[PDB]
Structure 1
Amino acid sequence: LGKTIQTISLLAYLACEKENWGPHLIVVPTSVLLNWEMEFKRFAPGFK
């Protein structure tokens, strides 16, 4: 359904309104990890 894009959107809401880009942590299986990196690039490339 787009859990991952919804995660992006939540973080981005934390970003715009709350300015809190603080060092968030996400722990994930190894295989999807790179796909996660790709989707971070795609949905919100401003995240380090």
Structure 2
Amino acid sequence: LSVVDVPVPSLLRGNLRTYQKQGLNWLASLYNNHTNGILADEMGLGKTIQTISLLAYLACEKENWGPHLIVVPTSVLLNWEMEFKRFAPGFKVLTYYGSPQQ
């Protein structure tokens, strides 16, 4: 399928249940060709773990883990920062909300 599967998901709690690894290597292939993808799978099938594992692979295989953006609806604003808090915690997460002062 023109995809090379070879991950090094270090500092990642848990493991993909043999269904998100294909998504991870598809995203790796998409990155390797400098393109944009659409992870439009069925709702509830772990999109967050897929993108978390993609970012972890990018941070491990490549020395680049610069400032990335997660644009999300308000309700999941906490969930995302908890999603890889329970999962791979080797990243530094920032949450942007809550009045001008803080």
TM-score by length of 2: 0.45
Deviation at 1:4, TM superposition (A): 0.2
Q: Distance in 2 between matches of 1:18 and 1:4?
A: 21
Size of the aligned set, in residue pairs, is 48
* Stretches (4+) displaced over 4 A: none
Give the match for residue 72 of structure 2.
28
Listed as ranges, the gaps of 5+ residues in structure 1 are none
CA-atom RMSD, angstroms? Answer: 0.7
Partner secondary structure for residue 30 of structure 1: coil
Higher relative contact order (CA 8 A, sep 6+): 1
Q: Which has the higher helix share?
A: 1
- TM-superposition CA deviations, 1:12-33 (whole Å, max 9, x none): 0101101211000111001001
Listed as ranges, the gaps of 5+ residues in structure 2 are 1-44, 93-102
Deviation at 1:11, TM superposition (A): 0.1
